[PDB]
Amino acid sequence: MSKTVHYLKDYQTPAYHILKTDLHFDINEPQTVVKSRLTVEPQRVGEPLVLDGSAKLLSVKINGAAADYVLEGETLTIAGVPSERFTVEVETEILPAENKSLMGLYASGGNLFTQCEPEGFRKITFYIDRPDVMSKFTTTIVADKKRYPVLLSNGNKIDGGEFSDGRHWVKWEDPFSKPSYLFALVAGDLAVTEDYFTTMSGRNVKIEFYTTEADKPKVGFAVESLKNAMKWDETRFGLEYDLDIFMVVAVGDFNMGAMENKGLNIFNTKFVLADSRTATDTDFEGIESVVGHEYFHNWTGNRVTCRDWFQLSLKEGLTVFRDQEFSGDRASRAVRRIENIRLLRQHQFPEDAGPTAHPVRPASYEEMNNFYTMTVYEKGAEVVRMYHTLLGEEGFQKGMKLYFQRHDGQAVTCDDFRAAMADANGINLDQFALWYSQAGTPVLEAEGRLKNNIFELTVKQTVPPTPDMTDKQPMMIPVKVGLLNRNGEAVAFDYQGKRATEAVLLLTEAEQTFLLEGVTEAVVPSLLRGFSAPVHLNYPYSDDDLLLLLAHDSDAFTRWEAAQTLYRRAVAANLATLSDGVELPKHEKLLAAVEKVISDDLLDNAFKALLLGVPSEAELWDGAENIDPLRYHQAREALLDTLAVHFLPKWHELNRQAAKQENQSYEYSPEAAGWRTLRNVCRAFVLRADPAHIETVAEKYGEMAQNMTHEWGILSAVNGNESDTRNRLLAQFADKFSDDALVMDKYFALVGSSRRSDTLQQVRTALQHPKFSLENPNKARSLIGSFSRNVPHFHAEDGSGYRFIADKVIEIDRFNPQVAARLVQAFNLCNKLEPHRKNLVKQALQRIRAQEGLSKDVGEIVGKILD
Ligand SMILES: N[C@@H](CNC1CCCCC1)P(=O)(O)O
Numbered sequence: 093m094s095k096t097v098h099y100l101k102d103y104q105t106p107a108y109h110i111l112k113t114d115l116h117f118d119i120n121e122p123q124t125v126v127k128s129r130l131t132v133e134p135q136r137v138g139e140p141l142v143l144d145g146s147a148k149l150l151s152v153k154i155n156g157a158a159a160d161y162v163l164e165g166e167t168l169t170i171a172g173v174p175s176e177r178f179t180v181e182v183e184t185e186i187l188p189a190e191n192k193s194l195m196g197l198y199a200s201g202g203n204l205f206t207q208c209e210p211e212g213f214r215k216i217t218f219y220i221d222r223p224d225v226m227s228k229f230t231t232t233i234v235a236d237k238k239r240y241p242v243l244l245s246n247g248n249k250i251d252g253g254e255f256s257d258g259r260h261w262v263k264w265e266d267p268f269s270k271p272s273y274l275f276a277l278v279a280g281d282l283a284v285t286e287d288y289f290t291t292m293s294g295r296n297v298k299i300e301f302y303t304t305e306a307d308k309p310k311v312g313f314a315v316e317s318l319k320n321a322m323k324w325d326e327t328r329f330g331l332e333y334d335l336d337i338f339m340v341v342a343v344g345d346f347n348m349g350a351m352e353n354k355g356l357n358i359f360n361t362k363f364v365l366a367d368s369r370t371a372t373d374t375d376f377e378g379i380e381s382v383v384g385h386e387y388f389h390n391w392t393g394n395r396v397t398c399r400d401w402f403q404l405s406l407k408e409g410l411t412v413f414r415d416q417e418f419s420g421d422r423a424s425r426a427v428r429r430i431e432n433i434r435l436l437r438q439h440q441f442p443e444d445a446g447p448t449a450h451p452v453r454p455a456s457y458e459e460m461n462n463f464y465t466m467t468v469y470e471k472g473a474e475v476v477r478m479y480h481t482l483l484g485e486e487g488f489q490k491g492m493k494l495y496f497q498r499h500d501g502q503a504v505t506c507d508d509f510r511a512a513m514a515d516a517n518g519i520n521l522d523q524f525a526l527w528y529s530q531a532g533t534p535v536l537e538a539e540g541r542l543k544n545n546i547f548e549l550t551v552k553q554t555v556p557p558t559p560d561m562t563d564k565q566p567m568m569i570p571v572k573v574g575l576l577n578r579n580g581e582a583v584a585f586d587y588q589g590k591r592a593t594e595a596v597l598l599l600t601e602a603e604q605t606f607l608l609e610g611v612t613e614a615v616v617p618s619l620l621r622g623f624s625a626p627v628h629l630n631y632p633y634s635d636d637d638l639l640l641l642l643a644h645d646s647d648a649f650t651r652w653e654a655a656q657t658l659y660r661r662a663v664a665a666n667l668a669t670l671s672d673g674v675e676l677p678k679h680e681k682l683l684a685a686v687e688k689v690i691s692d693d694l695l696d697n698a699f700k701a702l703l704l705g706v707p708s709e710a711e712l713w714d715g716a717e718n719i720d721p722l723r724y725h726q727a728r729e730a731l732l733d734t735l736a737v738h739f740l741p742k743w744h745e746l747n748r749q750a751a752k753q754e755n756q757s758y759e760y761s762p763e764a765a766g767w768r769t770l771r772n773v774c775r776a777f778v779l780r781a782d783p784a785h786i787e788t789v790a791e792k793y794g795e796m797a798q799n800m801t802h803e804w805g806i807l808s809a810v811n812g813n814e815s816d817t818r819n820r821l822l823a824q825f826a827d828k829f830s831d832d833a834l835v836m837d838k839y840f841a842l843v844g845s846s847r848r849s850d851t852l853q854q855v856r857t858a859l860q861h862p863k864f865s866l867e868n869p870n871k872a873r874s875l876i877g878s879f880s881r882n883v884p885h886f887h888a889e890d891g892s893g894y895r896f897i898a899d900k901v902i903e904i905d906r907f908n909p910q911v912a913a914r915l916v917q918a919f920n921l922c923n924k925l926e927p928h929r930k931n932l933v934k935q936a937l938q939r940i941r942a943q944e945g946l947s948k949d950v951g952e953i954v955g956k957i958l959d
């Protein structure tokens with residue numbers, strides 16, 4: 093055997109450039125014929141022309157004559173090519189209705205869509221399908237007019253016409269050179285929603301959102317979010333849109349959230365459709381973030397793109413950071429920052445600790461689809477955010493300006509972005525490069541002592557080995573710090589000649605001591621404020637120290653982290669008692685802290701809600717060996733039961749408070765959303781302590797179902813209830829919203845995520861629900877994905893959870909390797925499990941491995957876990 097592993101160190105500029113890409117699509121039933129004409133520019137004369145492609149090849153020509161070529165695997169090779177400019181004409185045939193991978197050209201809802209990133213364009217035609225090859229596209233499309241009245245592609249519509257036989261055609265010209273992965277085509281019967289935005293230079297931009305006729309009324313918020321994003325990028329980053337047309341297309345079958353194709357973005361329906369009746373406040377915020385994200389890609393991704401796919405975080409890390417700053421500037425910056433940190437530590441940290449751990453800029457990959465990960469995206473954003481921390485907003489923008497000045501119209505690397513940041517500010521960032529090349533979560537060990545009038549903060553750093561790399565050198569780690577006295581008041585100190593109440597301590601060595609001089613009283617340190625670096629901080633805090641930080645600190649994260657720590661320690665105490673077979677702990681100081689949080693009316697409602705959130709099981713067994721997931725589940729559940737029952741009267745009271753302040757404002761707004769978020773936390777505790785309350789809710793369900801946030805909130809709260817009423821409410825829910833695909837996703841999520849004893853069989857029934865389709869990524873993730881993360885059921889001792897998921901990985905991989913490769917990572921905890929479960933997981937992975945024709949996607953992941 094010899095698998096194909098791609099290595100960053102092997103990168104070489106392409107032997108050929110493509111200057112012009114003329115495409116012609118003849119759409120018929122069932123087949124679509126693609127005819128191309130490529131203007132090829134030799135870079136290394138004499139080398140064979142190598143084109144990537146997997147579509148059915150009908151013909152290929154060089155300068156109009158039948159070319160001498162060989163087709164081997166997914167590569168087309170022409171040995172004898174001219175020494176000077178020449179043309180290549182490829183004719184391929186596609187059957188989009190048979191394409192269930194949702195990559196390349198495929199069918200959905202009777203319409204045609206494309207998804208090309210990273211390497212889907214080669215599934216359409218034979219091309220030099222790599223992002224450092226940039227060409228100017230002109231796309232002609234021909235199709236039956238009544239079946240396909242809407243024909244879209246990148247850029248400006250410059251021509252079109254009618255044929256006597258009912259067909260019609262259009263011609264699209266994208267004047268901006270782009271890599272193949274940004275190509276897009278849409279053909280079908282879609283309703284259009286029109287609007288516009290006027291740029292700073294006074295140019296109107298026509299906005300067009302395309303959806304089904306039925307979904308059109310739900311696209312309003314996405315349009316407004318787009319216009320906000322366009323304005324924000326102008327005011328915050330000085331970036332202006334470069335076309336007089338911007339199109340967004342919703343598609344129900346889509347592997348991810350959205351795609352930033354130049355002037356023709358394609359969105360998963362869940363990140364563009366919403367109304368208060370069918371979408372939660374979180375869905376709205378999701379639309380705002382992703383719509384912004386895809387537009388922000390127009391500069392950070394499109395105008396400046398990636399030299400190679402190892403540089404993916406260059407556009408994704410940066411663009412995520414941008415949509416985060418966009419959402420933060422819109423509303424609730426502090427609360428939304430916590431949400432992002434929580435997401436990172438709950439999903440990215442486990443990845444950096446697991447068998448699939450990789451650097452933000454990987455050094456190798458087998459299948460690039462597997463590296464659109466939490467690391468590349470979210471940790472990538474944290475890396476970008478550290479530029480902002482080190483340089484400040486103005487300095488950051490200087491780097492942005494120089495970044496675009498240097499590389500507009502180019503395909504560059506993470507190094508180039510770092511260099512632009514360094515050169516624009518006249519600062520050295522050589523060591524910062526390690527954030528891109530070194531995987532793993534850094535661990536900080538901090539010690540504090542006040543002697544004389546100096547608070548000596550000693551901080552050590554180490555980064556654990558990862559499967560890709562053992563050697564990990566000291567990294568540039570900014571640690572924002574503060575000090576609180578016995579009364580929790582801000583204490584001033586002198587750091588390198590400056591008496592401020594806050595400072596960024598720059599840790600660059602294995603061990604450093606920071607001297608906070610001029611401290612005239614006892615202090616408790618506030619560390620890693622705002623999560624100034626993506627790291628694990630260990631400091632010897634007493635319980636009382638955490639109570640002080642939670643009660644009086646000025647930074648949102650450190651307050652929240654203090655609460656998180658108390659919860660974490662409480663679960664640790666539960667584990668001990670449950671293991672020793674004795675009564676549960678008292679958690680006296682925890683309960684005292686929570687009581688203070690609940691009764692504090694000066695706390696922001698959304699921030700209060702976060703303070704009342706308990707860390708996930710994954711957070712709780714972080715850095716543990718021989719894990720029994722059910723024991724951690726038991727300990728966490730026991731804590732939630734204690735909090736639920738102990739404060740039950742006050743959960744009602746707080747619920748009442750939030751209902752009054754909501755003030756019947758059921759439409760989405762950051763203000764009203766805050767109260768509902770808090771309200772739903774209360775509902776979760778109330779129905780945990782008093783399950784019978786479900787019957788009171790059911791009695792006045794209609795009165796209470798004033799929007800989807802409320803319906804979801806209550807169905808979530810009762811989803812674990814063993815009452816028959818739980819099942820009935822879910823059934824009524826499905827009946828009520830049977831016609832709304834996105835709401836049915838919620839239904840299947842509730843079925844798959846239930847703590848109830850009979851979840852496995854309810855899930856297997858859901859597989860045959862008429863509104864369920866395994867071939868639809870949203871549905872698959874909703875039902876199967878949720879189950880795979882259902883701790884008590886996925887990690888069932890009898891192994892039923894493992895066998896079920898393994899079957900579905902095998903089943904899904906037959907048509908959609910990407911969904912399957914994501915699903916199979918539910919087994920990532922394999923080697924850290926206790927012997928019995930680890931054995932069963934290994935059997936499942938071996939069974940997946942034994943499958944003939946198993947995708948490279950899943951195969952790569954399975955290898956990381958087993959080998
Ligand atoms: N680049 C976009 C995701 N593209 C996926 C879509 C489906 C196939 C793999 C690439 P995003 O990060 O802006 O959301």
Ligand SMILES: [Zn+2]
Nearest residue numbers: 385389408411
């Ligand atoms: Zn993106």
